[PDB]
């Protein structure tokens, strides 16, 4: 009957969300400011009902949705455009009706439709057959809630905003463009995870490597991080001949990963090695070089020409 | 069985609608006049059954309909593309038979069908099984009732008209085009959307606005209005200083933003001091100027070509 | 089982309807004639079953079916895909069976199926789930009435002829093409639809209007009539001053709309005038001229392009 | 539980059924021969298990089944696929098992399933799942096998052998393609339906009728004949003058319409002229000419594509 | 509580079943050879839980099963494919328990299931009622036969293999492919179906039968045989002329159809020939010239390709 | 999921895996090591989520997956991709997610997806909707959660590790090649195949057989063993006379196959052979030469080489 999707409590703060200040401003203004001071928004003015995030994949749109949901002080409705039901003799609209309707009585609430471009058909697709009932139903019901309930937030996280129909995006309110990460943002994104190996060289090297690794997405950064995690393990693959860097005064000889060519190295059962005698090497520049060697820029120039054209004619902020 | 949807009275005035006088009087002739003056309705005179609205979306079709909700002085039921269940396979038609049944036995009532383009068929293949019979039902319910005796009114509000079926088109009586509001109309939209704010110190400002802003609907204009309301709040959010120029007749001193180069002013922030002792400045021009610069027009010119093509097919007045 | 249709009685005469007396002759010959002269239909000469009406929308094929229904003297029942439909995801063949049988009980019977394309396809991919079963039943029932001897007359009215199936087409009688109204017919339809209103009766005016009104169905002409009827009401809503045109034979001084600077110009509003003294203005010539200035032509060619391909080498029968 | 379906049979000969002689001959082989000479089918040989007819619509395959039923001198069962169908939902195929049980319990019976395409064919749907069990039970009951078993001739008709299931085609025994008739067969078709009226009794006329036009089934020819018969009657409808062509030997003047320039011409209402005194006009070539000019030949080449793809490469007797 | 399924004893044996040497093999060691093993049944040899027969239609799976049932001398009850279903929508698996339990109670047992794909998929709909627990019940009963001594054997037979459910197959062992008979096998089948037919005993002519024919099964070959047998019937029916060939050694005057150009040929009709005096002529190559041209195969290559991907994918280990 | 998925606590051990050095390297660092020492990883290093097992068919990838699942005593859930593509028209996302939920509820489980390749296919048509969304869904679920709860392990299996996730193309994670067994391994598998039963020839003969087979699989060997079990069978069938074994040891006469004339060849026929007197002899070279004869080459040729090409290219880590 209901089939309601649960909303967990993820821990992503504003300090974790690196870069893009204007979006943060828009979101605080959108949700946090009316929660902080409600009597200001009265009479004529009403809060932003339909905020649109857009950009290429892996850039932290879902991550920002989760971030807002962390510091919401409110309910949430996580849902994908495709993943609930899709074409079974029609009827994928009742789900929407129960979604919005059950968001009405529970005031201050945040809806999130992941990838709205999947609903609309660019050539024909389901939009010719039965998905017109979806596109219509969303189009009508999104405005009917803000007419009745007054200020129920719907957050757009589309990848393809220009194939998307013009009728949806004019009913949907202000836009938020997501460009590629900049100096400070990429920099801080390196020092979030791990932190057991006590840093690397000074922050100038994070900027040098940063400018070398500029143009990467958030997922690309995550993959770099994962690579760096796996680096000492692939250094363990090459070893099987363990040297002790420290002295013999400790409880056990600290086994470092290294080749047999280096002196003072001996072999043993690598499977049955305890954690205390293990020791990771320092994270070298070759981590970033292996990252580079994975064929990086998914964000190519010719594809995002359209992104930046559909950007500039509306711009920062928007509808 | 019954499936009641609307039983409310949202307050909308006569003067809220701006563009086209003849478009309003078309409805007024068609809706209120026969109920008000039934003695005139005798013999050869027949009621204007069916009032379709069309045009580029955002301009004010749904808004017009929901104005009519206040202006009707009678019970009515809206409906989207939400004919319920085909899991049973049979009840989809019977719901329409109930819908048309619940309209006619109750004396003068209305039915609002949002987005008639969804309920459309012509190519067939996939339509034949499920929705072809729905379209046929739609056709057959407004076939015999159209002439002689009729206590029902049909309404329509589509995004794009030309994809609709020919049979529904020609058989439906009164279609109306809703263009982009002119300088006087949009000015009137500005004037009404001022509301409870303490005035604006100019009359030519509206002219400046509506002349500069070209190719805007009611929606995005109201969005701009919302923005320009939330501008001085942002000014307050950035600004710290306050020179005491508050009246003694009020309950207490009220915080308003002032310039840094101005002596005798406390610099305690909006966050520290209470919100009940806060004040917003009067609306300027520059807030609207920058609001225009942020919010560029949503309605593209390429979409209007086929709109006007449909107009020169059928036009402002129905048929 | 007992859920039957109600037989209403709209007084539609033969001489009132215009457009093709050959069709009328086919109808009378099929329906009324054998009731009239039953001895003339005894032997090889027989009344064939299944006269198909079709054409563009709003041309009056449904209305012509009602014209048969009026003067047939027939205990008839008509139904589209409303009552006769599957309910339990299965059986709607019995409904056809007892439908035909309950028509076979009283044998001055006509069965009118409005929009036969609803209960028809061609292959349908997964048509065996439902529609093939009912369609097949329909096919198998009227085999015995198509030729040989049975006293039932089937009728049909559809806008899309090519989507109708071959095997149904060869089960059916003569398919009478109903085109758009022509000069003389159209000319007739003006004064008949207007009724007994004072409409300055001269045939030259009808000649002129009929000349000017090119490319119009029958329904749109009734809409035009309706517009012309609504016109003097509109003048009543734009009537500032009134004057007594008629003499003092009636009980009160009868007031009718006039020019502002006229003799005896009473200033009270149109709503304040009582029904006994409220007299509508007489119908002019230019009211129609302006009506057709507002009322643009109805007939789009795109639908008729296939009918141009049809009517030449198809038209009468399949072919 | 028991519900038998048996009906009376009027006169239908072998001679009047025009078409392929081998098809009729094959039916003689399958029907009359085993009853006449049963000792021939005792040992190696067995009677024909089943013959499925197929072709374009209105070709007389149902009429052929009728003819066989007349000339069988046996218990002729005839029932469609969707007639015997589950009302209860639980029980379903037991109706079929009782039916073929009835076929077994009576000595050599003949079964007829009109439109076999209703069931049989499916593309992984299973006709709403539940009715796949009928599809399945039809095979396991041992009807279509070409080995051993009781002599029970199952018959059928279909317009779509490509939609028909391959496994059943392979299972069920013999096919007969029913083609469209040629000069000779068509000529016969003309010369049968005559009756009391002696039109123009020569072979030149019928061979002109057959030679001029082309592309006919059997039902359309019948329709044409009917039209031709009705021609003089509709000419009696438009009868101004009257003439006594009949001799004085009769009881009263058997009147008929005539040309204006005639000796002893009289004018009155044609309705008052009774059956005994109404001499009908004799039929002519021009009557058939006008018949043709109204009633077109009814064959379409789009149906012949998928038919001939099933036939032309193979020839006769099936796929 | 009547559970008396039709026990029968056909006259088919291993000698008159041509082709499928591997299948004949695999059934010999699955049943009859295990009947001769009441000592080395379990231990070395793993007994078969179930045998799946699959392939194109008309290959002879049912025929094979029946032959087996004749041969083995076992308590056999071939299941009704569809009828194991809830009549009252309550009891259902009681019938399964009646089947399997009584099949266990006499342990020279065989259970044959023609069309195991009757339990077709799921798709929701009406499968969730008693059919779900039928599906489960099959699985519990085949877990029942898995335990204890394997007297019962699940002989799976189906036309469409891929539509059968996964979970049945995953708990199922033996899968014997049944292809179309090759040249030798087809020749031997012809030889079998000849039997007691006059003459035609030359191996070059049986080559000739085998050579021209391509891609056939047992059903269509039987049909061909039947046709061949019916040729001399037609040659009797056509030939009016006759002559006595038999001498005084034969007692009865054996009448037989002579050549047309024959001196002193009596011309009494074929219908006047009595049973005692009849003599039908011997078969020739002329019969097979007409048979091969007339009769033709059904199933396409693509079905066999589906069987080849089923062959390559499924069959091995536990698929 | 309604018995489509297998579940058990398997007890499959390292000792039964003959020489799979690759598994023994990769799994022991990826899975076993984290099980042993969870705290052994510095920073945010967390266990592998997905492992692809890839190689030719019949290497017991299932056996290996079960052995992996044996180590934590983890529940082994497993499902076939092929099986849920065509039957349902797989929109199984909701059920996959529920599956994951239920498996997550049970503390560490392992998910096994067999033939992951069957999901891929950039073909087009209606297959797109039943493939593309599954592929998208697969690529989301492979990193559906950010470590934390996907310590629960996904094992993919493929025989054709080209085309999409297994291939050069994109994504996955750590992959392992599962090679065919070498001579020694195959010999050990022969040693482990079934439970012998009375006496065979030498382990070196089996090495000879294993030497004779290059590129043949564990499954091919299992086919040879299934053929081995039929050696006594085919002895029973093919010999006409047998020879006595019972000297002074056995109580009753017991036979082995020989030629008709031999020293101690009993003379009654194979058909006569009673239960007790039947005795399978030892399996000799001649029985295995006959096994060599009756096992044709199994294996596809070009895939081996392509997978060697991918092995040379990739294998280490994700792509
Ligand atoms: N501004 C940011 N600050 C820190 N981390 C980020 C930022 N943007 C992206 N990331 C990282 O990228 C990872 C994945 O990004 P995410 O999947 O949210 O992108 P997405 O565009 O929403 O993808 P999809 O549209 O497919 O859901 C996150 O785990 C997060 O750590
Ligand atoms: N030939 C005519 N004579 C008189 N009135 C007509 C004629 N044609 C149309 N009308 C008027 O216009 C209306 C036509 O409506 P109607 O529903 O019959 O059109 P239709 O084409 O049959 O509809 P559909 O396409 O649904 O079958 C009628 O109410 C009738 O009064
Ligand atoms: N060869 C023929 N001889 C005599 N009458 C014929 C012949 N062919 C057609 N007819 C006449 O025309 C009609 C044909 O209708 P019938 O249903 O028998 O054809 P059909 O091919 O079975 O149609 P369908 O395939 O649509 O069921 C019959 O009523 C019959 O009187
Ligand atoms: N090897 C054979 N020898 C003799 N006759 C055969 C052979 N194979 C098939 N036939 C004949 O063809 C017919 C095949 O019918 P059968 O029902 O056994 O095929 P099937 O594939 O099981 O069909 P279904 O699956 O629809 O039951 C049998 O009646 C039999 O006479």
Residue numbers in the entry:
A (entry chain B), B (entry chain C), C (entry chain D), D (entry chain E), E (entry chain F), F (entry chain A): 119 to 437
The article reads:
We purified the full-length yeast Vps4 containing an E233Q mutation, which allows ATP binding but blocks ATP hydrolysis, and assembled Vps4E233Q oligomer in the presence of 1 mM ATP in vitro. We used single-particle cryo-EM method to obtain the three-dimensional (3D) reconstruction of the 300 kDa oligomer without imposing any symmetry at a resolution of 3.9 Å. The structure appeared as a hexameric ring, consistent with the MALS result. Although we used the full-length Vps4E233Q for the oligomer assembly and the Vps4E233Q protein in the hexamer was intact as evidenced by the SDS–polyacrylamide gel electrophoresis (SDS–PAGE) gel showing a molecular weight of ∼50 kD, the six MIT domains exhibit no EM density, likely reflecting their dynamic locations due to the long linker of ∼40 residues between the MIT domain and the followed ATPase cassette (upper). The subunit A shifts slightly away from the ring centre, and the interaction interfaces between it and its two adjacent subunits are only about half of those between the other subunits. Moreover, the ring is not planner, in which subunits arrange in an upward spiral from subunit A to subunit F as manifested by the relative positions of the α3-helix and C-terminal helix in each subunit, resembling a split right-handed spiral ring. Agreeing with this, densities for nucleotides are clearly visible in the nucleotide-binding pockets of subunit B through F, whereas there is no clear density in the nucleotide-binding pocket of subunit A, suggesting that subunit A is likely free of the nucleotide. The inter-subunit interactions occur both between the large ATPase domains and between the large ATPase and the small ATPase domains including the β-domain.
The disassembly of ESCRT-III is mainly mediated by the Vps4 protein that is a member of the type I AAA+ ATPase (ATPase associated with various cellular activities) family and oligomerizes into a functional hexamer with elevated ATPase activity upon binding to ATP6. Powered by ATP hydrolysis, the Vps4 oligomer, promoted by the cofactor protein Vta1 (Vps twenty associated 1), disassembles ESCRT-III polymers into individual ESCRT-III subunits available for recycling. Vps4 protein contains an MIT (microtubule interacting and trafficking) domain at the N terminus, a single ATPase cassette comprising a large ATPase domain and a small ATPase domain with a β-domain inserted within it, and a C-terminal helix8111213. In this study, using Vps4 from yeast, we solved the structures of the ATP-bound Vps4E233Q hexamer at 3.9 Å resolution and its complex with Vta1 at 4.2 Å resolution, both determined by single-particle electron cryo-microscopy (cryo-EM) without any symmetry imposed.
